[PDB]
Design a binder for this molecule. Sequence first.
Ligand SMILES: Nc1ncnc2c1ncn2[C@@H]1O[C@H](CSCC[C@H](N)C(=O)O)[C@@H](O)[C@H]1O
Lengths: 15, 481
Amino acid sequence: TLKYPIEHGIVTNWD
Amino acid sequence: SPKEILNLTSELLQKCSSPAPGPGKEWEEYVQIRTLVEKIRKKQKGLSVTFDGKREDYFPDLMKWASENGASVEGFEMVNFKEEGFGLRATRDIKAEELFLWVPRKLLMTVESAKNSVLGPLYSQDRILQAMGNIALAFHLLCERASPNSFWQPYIQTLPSEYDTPLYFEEDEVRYLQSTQAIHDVFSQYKNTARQYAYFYKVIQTHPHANKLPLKDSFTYEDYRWAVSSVMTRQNQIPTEDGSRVTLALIPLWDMCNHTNGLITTGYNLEDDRCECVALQDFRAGEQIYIFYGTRSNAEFVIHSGFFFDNNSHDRVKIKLGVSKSDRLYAMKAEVLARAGIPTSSVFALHFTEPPISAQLLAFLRVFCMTEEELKEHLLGDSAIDRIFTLGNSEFPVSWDNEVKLWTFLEDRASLLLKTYKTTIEEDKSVLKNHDLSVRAKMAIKLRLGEKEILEKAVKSAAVNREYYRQQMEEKAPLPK
Ligand SMILES: Nc1ncnc2c1ncn2[C@@H]1O[C@H](CSCC[C@H](N)C(=O)O)[C@@H](O)[C@H]1O
């Protein structure tokens, strides 16, 4: 399947 | 005037750097921080850089700029949809699985391009920028926005000027979220954003490496709220050009696609060094082109993407569980969990599915309810490792008694969690039916309604499972093995 799937607006840590 | 903002930001920095006041005073702290932020906002001039034209006036330049750099620009147009805002609409029939959208890396704004920009010198000095690529992207966006000759101006001039993240909510709109799980993440987001603004406001003024930034001349709270909201609602994880690690990036043109349910059909092609998107489904000419953002919850969609998705099949709530140190079997339970790769205490999820629990939560609950005899069988002998291996498998219970205990516990706990909310499901539905609300207000109310509906379904599913395994027990059914 997708080797590098791209997630629109992937959630990150802001602190 | 200039010394007044420095006073307020200094006051804001100590306020937002202070430790949490306890959960019972978190709303009061939130209102206090809101009061300082609004005082600063009323004394500033909004966004430092604003553009003369309307949003749609700049989309033709986005298309020309993307076309010159190798991106796809044919087969779709930009349309202001009522439900989702601006998005892509097909101008021809697009078949499912057709590669219709591609964006070369040259067009992307990345942490790497942030390092190479005017932000470079300050980036090399500030530990926060080095540790938090998302914040670095936000300042990269701000510095290029205020640079009239920036390579990325066609992209920045077509971005939204406002968002529906909780940073933009009124106080009374957030107040709907009192007593929920989600409001604590709303509290943290607001406090983090205010602390970051005051910190970087002072850093830009004291660091000589920032003297060439346009932000040295103007850096408003509105600038920062806009920048972090632009990043959190649109950022992506992609491999580095090396392909050896991951970085964060804004992907022009493609990120105009709005969200629908389905599978991820966007991936990075490292050979050709470009983002590629294949059609999630058939799109006839005149239909909006959607993508699937990811398997995120509505709490994540609201807080980080600024929208609530009806019929989100991946919705979930959090449930914190752990083995008590006063449990006489703590040591044995902690060791079985450690051998299974599960922490003694953690935040798990309850899903809007049957069963509502993952394999990891099932394994935890089984150990949580084990007798000393059952624990010994998972710790000693030639079959212990096989027993650990099936701990997360619904088809292989430890015993009928262990199943009845764990589903009884989950039914009781989800019922207790429901009792901690300020409103009932029926009351929330009446509010949505009989009051006229803003988009942001309904996001909040549907969020608190969705939390209780997931818990309510978990109660029903656990009660059904309790009865199934109670029948196996009373009928003395053989354990599967
Ligand atoms: N299914 C949906 N329903 C409502 N809003 C949506 C949506 N999918 C995406 N959005 C909106 O689109 C944003 C993602 S970026 C997508 C393009 C955006 N609509 C724009 O005008 O630039 C989100 O922050 C959200 O506000």
